Amino acid sequence: QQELATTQDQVASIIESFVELGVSIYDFTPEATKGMITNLQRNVDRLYKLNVRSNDPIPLEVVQYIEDGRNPDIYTREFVEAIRRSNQYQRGKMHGLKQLRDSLADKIVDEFPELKEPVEDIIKRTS
Amino acid sequence: DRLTQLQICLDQMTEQFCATLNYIDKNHGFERLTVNEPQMSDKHATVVPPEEFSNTIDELSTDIILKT
Amino acid sequence: YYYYVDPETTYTYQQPNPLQDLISVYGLDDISRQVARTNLDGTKAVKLRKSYKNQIADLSGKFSTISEQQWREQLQPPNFDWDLCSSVLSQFERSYPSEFANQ
Amino acid sequence: ALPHVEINQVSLALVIRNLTVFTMKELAQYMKTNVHTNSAKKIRFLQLIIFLRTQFLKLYVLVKWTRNFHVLIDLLNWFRTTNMNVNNCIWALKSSLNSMTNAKLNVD
């Protein structure tokens, strides 16, 4: 997490260099803004190496929210509700499907007794 | 007559093999897991109560036995 | 009977078993505690802006919500000239430009 | 063991890397176009610094959100795969009935 913290810190440093550089070119001495743009490019190169050190990896709604201007907190939140709702959905399908399996299986059990013993093996297999 | 009834009963066996799974694969319920069961958004889930779902499972499980 | 338990194998219940609390199995309960609509105490954990206004609020200045994928499609170090650039920026006269807001 | 996909996501050193590459290309292009002309270099430079500034706002948002990326999606991708696996059999069950009439063959 320290790499993310230092690359984020330098990100804030260089965006602050864009702030003070814009204020400097608005309220315009050369050495201040020349040293400010060399600090800009230096912070750029530290973005290069710092993020090369970091290395972290419509379906890709993240970048869509970054470009359009949305908060990915609702993205990952809808992902929590999607994994929970999908878990209850699949488990519900398997529950009702098991109800059909033992319901119809027991119906065949009371249908004929000579087929009851093997279908018991069917309801006891894959265990 | 005697030859057609076998084909009709067979086609009904297949149509029941599909229709029996069609209802469960479309209308069913979730599970409480350990916290809650119903989601706040139940627009496309059309959750049916477990009573009519169980009775429907019993009926669809009975029709195939009757036809058999 | 034929085709009766013919694939003699223990095709076990699917390894990511939905019968188990998969949120607790994969350890996604902390991020759930962080991003859920309801907090662990009980109050509504919403109050999140539809935009990233909190993180531009971590910065300073007016930020009106306004390319990168195209860069990802076609990806070593660029070039630069110091004396030529310093000679380029050495020009800005003290006269004010046109009309643009400092908002 | 759950299948771990590799596509659908892009690394971070790539987005910042080609980012600042594109920004340096902008500083070179505007650097070559401002010299030729009288009051357009100023507003043009302000436009460049504010546009780069807001793209870098977007990247500030991404970097702050990143606090790995591949693992948090593959689970839901698999949960989406299983549902389709449940739905793929019904169409075959419908095609079998159509395949049975060709085998079925009263007499006058």
Side-chain angles (χ1 to χ4, degrees), chain A residues 5 12 22 30 32 35 57 59 69 72 82 92 96 105 113 118, chain B residues 1-26 29 38 45 49-68, chain C residues 7 16 18 27 36 42 45 57 61 77-78 97 101, chain D residues 1 3 13 28 40 92 103:
Chain B
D1 183 30
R2 304 304 302 178
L3 181 60
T4 309
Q5 292 179 111
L6 301 179
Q7 326 301 131
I8 294 180
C9 290
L10 185 59
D11 299 334
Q12 290 302 315
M13 287 299 295
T14 303
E15 290 175 288
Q16 288 177 333
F17 285 160
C18 181
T20 303
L21 300 177
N22 288 334
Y23 183 85
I24 300 184
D25 293 332
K26 292 185 301 180
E51 301 180 68
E52 300 180 18
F53 182 65
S54 59
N55 296 130
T56 309
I57 289 183
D58 299 327
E59 295 298 326
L60 295 179
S61 302
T62 309
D63 299 328
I64 305 181
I65 304 302
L66 300 181
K67 198 62 175 179
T68 302

